[PDB]
Amino acid sequence: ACDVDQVTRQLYEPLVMQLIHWFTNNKKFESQDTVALLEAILDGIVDPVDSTLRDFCGRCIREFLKWSIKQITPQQQEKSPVNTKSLFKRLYSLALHPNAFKRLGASLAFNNIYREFREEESLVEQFVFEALVIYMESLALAHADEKSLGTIQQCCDAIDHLCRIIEKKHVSLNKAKKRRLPRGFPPSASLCLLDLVKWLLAHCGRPQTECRHKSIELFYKFVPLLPGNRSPNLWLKDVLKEEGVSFLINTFEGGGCGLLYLRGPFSLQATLCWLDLLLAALECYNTFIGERTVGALQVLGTEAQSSLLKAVAFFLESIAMSPQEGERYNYSKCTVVVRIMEFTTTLLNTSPEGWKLLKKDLCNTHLMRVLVQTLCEPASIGFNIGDVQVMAHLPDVCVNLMKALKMSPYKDILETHLREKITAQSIEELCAVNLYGPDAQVDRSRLAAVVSACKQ
Amino acid sequence: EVHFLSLATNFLLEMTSMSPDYPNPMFEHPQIKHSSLITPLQAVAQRDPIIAKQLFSSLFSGILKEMDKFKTLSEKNNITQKLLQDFNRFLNTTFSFFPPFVSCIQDISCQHAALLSLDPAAVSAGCLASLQQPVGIRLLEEALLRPPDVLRWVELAKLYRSIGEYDVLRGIFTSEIGTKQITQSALLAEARSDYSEAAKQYDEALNKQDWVDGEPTEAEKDFWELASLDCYNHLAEWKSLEYCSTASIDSENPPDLNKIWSEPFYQETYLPYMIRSKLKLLLQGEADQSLLTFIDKAMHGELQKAILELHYSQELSLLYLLQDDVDRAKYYIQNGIQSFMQNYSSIDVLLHQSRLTKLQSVQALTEIQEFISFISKQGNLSSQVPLKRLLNTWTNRYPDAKMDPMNIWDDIITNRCFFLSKIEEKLTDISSLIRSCKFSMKMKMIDSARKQNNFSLAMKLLKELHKESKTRDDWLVSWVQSYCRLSHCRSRSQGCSEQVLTVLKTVSLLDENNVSSYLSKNILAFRDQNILLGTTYRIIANALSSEPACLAEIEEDKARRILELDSEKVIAGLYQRAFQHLSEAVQAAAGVIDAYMTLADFCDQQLRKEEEQAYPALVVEKMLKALKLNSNEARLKFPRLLQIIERYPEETLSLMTKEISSVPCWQFISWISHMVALLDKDQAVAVQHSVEEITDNYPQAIVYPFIISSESYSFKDTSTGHKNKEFVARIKSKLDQGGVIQDFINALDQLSNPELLFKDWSNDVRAELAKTPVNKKNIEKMYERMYAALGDPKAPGLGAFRRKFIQTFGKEFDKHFGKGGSKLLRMKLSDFNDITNMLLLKMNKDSKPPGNLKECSPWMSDFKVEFLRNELEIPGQYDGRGKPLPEYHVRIAGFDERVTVMASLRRPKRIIIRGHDEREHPFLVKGGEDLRQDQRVEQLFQVMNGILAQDSACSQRALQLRTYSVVPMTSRLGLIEWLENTVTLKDLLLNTMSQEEKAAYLSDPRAPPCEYKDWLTKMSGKHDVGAYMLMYKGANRTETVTSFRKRESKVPADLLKRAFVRMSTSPEAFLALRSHFASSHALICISHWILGIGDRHLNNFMVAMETGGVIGIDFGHAFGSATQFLPVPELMPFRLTRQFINLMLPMKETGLMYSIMVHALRAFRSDPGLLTNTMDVFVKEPYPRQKICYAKRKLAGANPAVITCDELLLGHEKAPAFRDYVAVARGSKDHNIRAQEPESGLSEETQVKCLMDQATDPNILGRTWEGWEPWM
C-alpha cells in the first residue's frame, strides 16, 4: 500500500482500506481473519527501520477506529474482544513496554485516533481521558532510549493532543462518576480531576526529565480548571497550611536524597540516579518559586529543615573532584551544575529578600568557583567539547547568573574572585610577544577562552 | 527452451478465452470477471521463468488429471508414453540446460507413475549440467522405489557425488553396488581416511582373477575403478592417478587422444582425474610433455574445446603460465572467476556443503590471479621487499586445518610452490628465506594433514621433504619432530602390538644426532623434543601395560631395547625414563601447558591403574599452572586429588591454594556449582579466594548450594568449621544483599502451583516421619519453611507480596491449615496420612492449574525496572571460556502478560520474560524439582560438542548437539531456556497424518497401543507390570518379532517423509531437511548412548520446524537408569525406530545414520579423558563406581549388549527371568551381529554396527514400555 511508486501505491491503498472496511463488519466480526488483520497492522505499527510503514499503519488504525464503532452496535458492545475498549487496552500494553519501538507505535496510534474518540462521547470518559497517566508513564519509560528515536517527540505530541481535549471535556462534566480506575491511582469511586492534579502533584520531581516537565506544564495549564478557577499562588499556600508543612517540601525532595566513593568520577548508575533526583528537585523548585507560585523564602529556610540546600552545597563542594562511561557521568553532572546555576538565578532575581537563607557555604568558593570555571575552561568540570545545546547555551546561563548576582550583596566575592582569574596581568601576559606561529594550541586556545569569558 | 515454458502456457491459456465460462466466477458480495486472473498470470509468467515453470507444471498436472475422465486406459497409456518419449527427447536434445525447464519436466515427471521411468542417464546428465541435482535426486529416488534399478543407483550415486553428501554416497557403494566382501572392506578403509589399503584392494580386487563365488558385476568393476581414482587422488600419488585414468579406457601404452572424447562416459569419468594428475605432476617439477600436447591439439573445433575451457578454467591457467603465454593464462583465470560466479549463484542456498566446496576454490583461484598480477611488474624483479611482504601475507593466509579437505591444502601449497619457484628463478638473503618459506609451508601442510587423520599423505610428505631437510639444525629438529609426532598420532587406532611396534621404531631416529649438542641452545625446541621423546616412551610403556606376558611374547632383537630402556621391571624402566624426559620438558604457545598435561595425565592414568611417587601431589601444580592459562582439560582436577588428599591429608594443599590465588578467576564459573559443594564439607579451604573474587567481579553464584547444603551440612565446633561457616555466611551477606535476586526467586517460587508444593511436602512427611519415629526436630525445623508460603494468606505477603494462589487457596484451605497448625505441628507420626490425601485431592479439584495470566505474581507482572537495585541479569549467561561482560549480557526489562501452563504431572509453566536487547526470551520454570541433572548433562553436551568442533571429521560434517541453557536458581526452582520455532516429534507425526488414521491410531482395539495391551494381558495372565518377566520364558524370538511386525504394519511407514515433503515446496528443501534431521539425530543418539540416556519417548525429542534438526530434552535419566532401576527396563541404546528408518529409503539405514555415528564415536574415543572424568565429577557427589566403569567400557571400546547386560545384572540381581533378560540383551548369535562379536577391542565402526543392530533389534522393541511407543 505505502510503496515507493505511485501506481502500486494508489493501487493497494484502496485495497487495504477496503479490507479494513469489510473485515470490520458483523459478517467478518469475531473472526480469526479480523484478529489476524489487526495483529498484522499492529506489528507493522511497531517495528524497526520501516517508518513509511508506521505512518500508513497509524492511518490503518484510525480507519479501524472509525469502522469498528461504525459497525458494532451498543447492544453487543459488551463481549467483543476486538472492540475499541480492548483495542485501547492493547494500545496501553503496547505503550507500557520496555521496547523503544512499541511505545512509539502506541504513540502513533494515539496521534492518529485522537481526531476520533474526541468527537465521540457517552463512553469516552473511562478509556483515555482517565488514561492520560498511562501515556505519561510511557513518557517516563522513554527516559532512556534515545532522543533521536522520536519516542519522546511523539509521546509529547500525544500528551499534548490529550490535554487539549481533557481540559475542555472535564471543565463542565466534572462530577463524581464511576470513571474507570487508571494505574497507580488510589482505589475510589470518583476520580474526576482533583486526584488528577493530586497525582500530578505526587511527582513533579520524578527523576525522569521529560515526564517531569510535562507534569509541571500540566499543572500550569490545569490548575485554572477547578470550579473555583483559582491560580497556584494562593493554592500552594492554602494546601501547605491545611496539609502540614512537610507535604510540599517532601513531595519535591524525591525518594532517595540520603558518599565519597563517587567523589572521583564514576558511572555507577546509583550515582547517576541520585544526580537525576537532585535535578528533579532543582527543576521543580526553580519552576515553582521562580514564578509567583511560591516565595523563595516560603519553601526555603531552616524552619522546615529542608534538604535541597545541603545536597547542593555538597554538590558544589564535590562536583569537579569505565573509560567511556566517564563522559556519561560528566554529561549528567554538567546538566545539573547548569541547573543549579539557573536555580541561583531564579532564587536571586525573584526576591532580593531571602538571600539570607543562601548561607555562606555557596557564598564561599563553591558556587563562584564553578561559575569561574565555566567562564574560563568549561572543560575543567567535565563539559565535553563536542556538544550542541550545552556549549552554545552556557554563556547565557552564566551571564544571567552574573546579572542576578550583581544586584544582590554577593557581588563582592564575585568581583574579588573573577579578579583572581581575569585579573589584568593574566590578559596582558597572555598577549605575549609572538601569538602568530606554530604554537597555536596553547596560546590561541587560552586567549580564546579568556576573551570569551571577558565578553560574557 | 528459455521461453518454451511461457510459450506453452500462453498457447494453453489462449483456448480458455473463447469459452463461455466468464460469468464473474463468484457473482456475489465480499465481483470480478473470470479473466483478470488469467491474463496477468500469463503476463508475469513470461517475465520470470519461475512462474513460467510453475504454471506449466501445475497446468500440465491439471490437464493430465482431467483427462482421467475421458481417454480410456489404453488411450491413457498411449498418451503418457507419447509424453515420456517427448520428455526423453527434451532431456537428450537440450543444448543449454535452462534450470527451470529441466526442473519443470523433471518434477512433473515425478508426480505421475507412468512418466516416472524417464531416463536415468539423461536425468543425471541434465541435473549435472543444469546444477539442479535435487530434482533428479527426487526423481531417481522415486524410480528406485516401486539393470534399470542398478543404473538408477549408479546415477543417484553419480549425482550425490556433486552435492557432497559423501556419507550417503558411500552408503550405497556398500549396500546396492555390493554383494561381494572386498567392497565393504575397501569402503571402510576409505571412510576413516586410510586411503592406502582402500586403493590397494581396489587394485588387487580389480586385478583379481577367479574368486569362485560369483563374477564381479560391471556396475561394481567401474565403481572400483572410480573409487581407486578418487582414493589415489586423496593421497596424491599422481603417478598412480594418471595410470588409473588411462587404465580402463585403452591399452597400457599412453596414446592420449580423442579416445577420451568419444563415448562421453570416458569424458566425465577420466578427463578431470587425467588432467589433474598430469598437470599436478607438471607443477611439482617435471616436463613429460604429456597433457600439454593433448590440450593444444584440443584447442580446435567446438566439442573438444568448449567442455574443457568452460568447466576447468583454472588448470588451463596453470598450464598456460607454464607455457608462459601470460595473456591467455590470465584470460583463463578471469574466465574461472566468472565460472565460480555463475556456478555458485546456481547452487541453491539450502544446498549447504555444495556452496562450501564451491567457495573453497576461491582462495586458490585468487592466489593464481594475484600471483600472475604480482609477477607482471617490471620493477618487481629488482626490489626485494615486495617479495618480503608477499611472503608475509602468504604465510599469514592459509587454508584452515580441520575444515578444509586435503585437496584444498594440496592446491594452495603446490600452486604457491610453483609460483615461488618461478619467483626464485626470476631473481637469482632472498633465496634463504625462499627455502625457509617452502619448508615451513610444506610443514604446515603436513601438520594439517596429520591432525585430520590423513596419515599416509603426511608420511609421504615427510618422505619427500626428508632429502632437503638436512641443511640446518632447526630443519633437522623440525623434520624429526614432525615425523615423530606423526608416528605418535597415527599410533592410536592401531592394535596394542602394532602401536608398540610402530612407536618403538621412532626411538633410534630420536636418540641419534638430534639430541646431540642440540639439547643446549633452543630451550623451547629442546622442550618440544623432550615431549616427543617422553611421549614415545609413554606410548610404549602404556602399551605393554595391557598384559604382563603376551605383550612381551611376539618380539625380537628390539627386545634388547625393551631390555635396555624380569619382564615386569621393564614397565618401571620405560615409565621412569619417560618421566625424566617428560619432567625435563616440564622445567623448560601452550608448550609449557603441553608439558603440564603430558606429565599430569601420565601421573593420573598411572594412579587410576594403581587404585585397583607423589603423583597425587605432583598433578595439582601443573594442572593449576595450566588453568592459570586457559584450558578446558586443566579445568578439572580439584575434586579427584582433593579426594586422594582426603585419603592423605598431610601434604600439598597450600601450593594448590597459592597457584589458584594468582590467576584471572573467570575460569571457575563453569565449575562453580561443584566447588561450592565442598564448602559444606571438610578441607573446604581449597576454594575460598577465587570464589570470593568471582563474587566481586561476577556476583551471583552462591545462592544455590548454601540455602540447601547449609541445612544439609552440620557444622560442629571444629576449629576450621566455624571459620568456613562464617566465610559462607559473609559471602551470602555480601552477595545476597539487594533482596532483588531473592525477590525474583520468591516470585518464581510462588509461580509454582500451591497444590504441587503441598504434594511435595506430603511426600516429604510420608517418607521422613513414617519410617521410624526417631528422626526428631526435623518436622519442627521444616514446617515453618512451607508455612512461610502456604497456610495463612498473609505469610507470602510478608515474604514477597499478596499472592492470588494463596488468595484462592489459603482462604479456601483455612479450617484445614488451622488443624494442621494445631495438630500436625508436633504429631510426628505420619501413621494416618489420609488427611493429606484428601487435602491434596481437594486442591486438585478446586485449585485449578489454569492461573491463566501472569498477574498472579505482581512483582513479575509489574517489574518495570525503575532504579538500579542490582538489576536481575536473566539467568543463563556466563558460559565459560571467555572474559564475562555483564554489560553485553541481556538484563531483564519486563514480562509478557501471559502464562501458559504446559501440561505435565508436576506441571511446570512457561514465561516470556522480556529483555533490553529489544529481542525476547521465553523460558520454562520448574518448581519443586531439582535441575542439577539437566544443567549438568547439558554441561556434558557442551564439552562433547566442544570435542566435536575440534575433530576434523566431525567438524567438516558440522556435527553439533543442540543444547539449551539450563540454570537452576535453587533446588525446587529452576528455569530452562526454551528455544524458538521448534516442535515435538509427536506433533509432526500426528499433524502430518490424516484424520482417519489418527482416529484409527487413537481409538481402535487393533491399534498398536490397544493391540500391545491386549497382547500382554491375553497371553501373559494379568494387566500390569511384572508380566514381562512371566512372558520372557515363553516369548521366543520368532513369535515376538512376528507380533511386532504385525502391530507395526498398522502405523504408516512413509509418515515422517510425508512431513518433510509437506513443508518443503522444493526438492532442495526436502533434501536439506532430511539430511539435517538424519545427521543431527544420529549424533543425538550416539551421544545419548555414550552416557546412557534412558526414557527416549517420542515426546523427549524436539525438532526445528525451520531446519529439521533435532534437539534432545528432559534428561531425567542420565546414566543407565531406566535399564537398572525402572520396573520396565529399557534394553536399547537409543531410539532408532521404524519412521527414522523409512525416512531415508531407498537409501539403506547404514549410509548416513551410520557414518555420522562412526565419526562421532571416533571423536569420543579419541579423548584426553574429558568425557570420562567430567562424568566422574558428574556422579561422585551426594554403585556409581560401576556406572563410571560402564561408561569407561562403552567409551573405550566394548560390546553394547554386554554393557546392557552389566547394567541389568547390576540392577536386576536374582530378578525373574534374568536369563531371558540377558539373552534378549546379548542377541541371538545367528541374527544379530551384537552377539557374534567379542567382548571389547571393537573398532568404532564395529561398535556402532553392533549398536545399531541392537537398536533396530526386533527382539527388544517387541517388549518394552507401552508409552515409549516402539512402533513409531
Ligand SMILES: COc1ccc([C@@H](O)c2cc(-c3ncnc4cc(N5CCOCC5)ccc34)c(F)cc2Cl)nn1
Ligand atoms: C509443545 O511443546 C512441548 C515440548 C515438550 C513437551 C513434553 O515433553 C514436556 C517436556 C518438559 C521439559 N522438561 C525438561 N526440559 C524441557 C526443555 C524444553 N525446551 C528447551 C529447548 O527448546 C525447546 C524447549 C521443553 C520441554 C522440557 C516438561 F517439563 C513437561 C512436558 Cl509435558 N510438551 N510440549
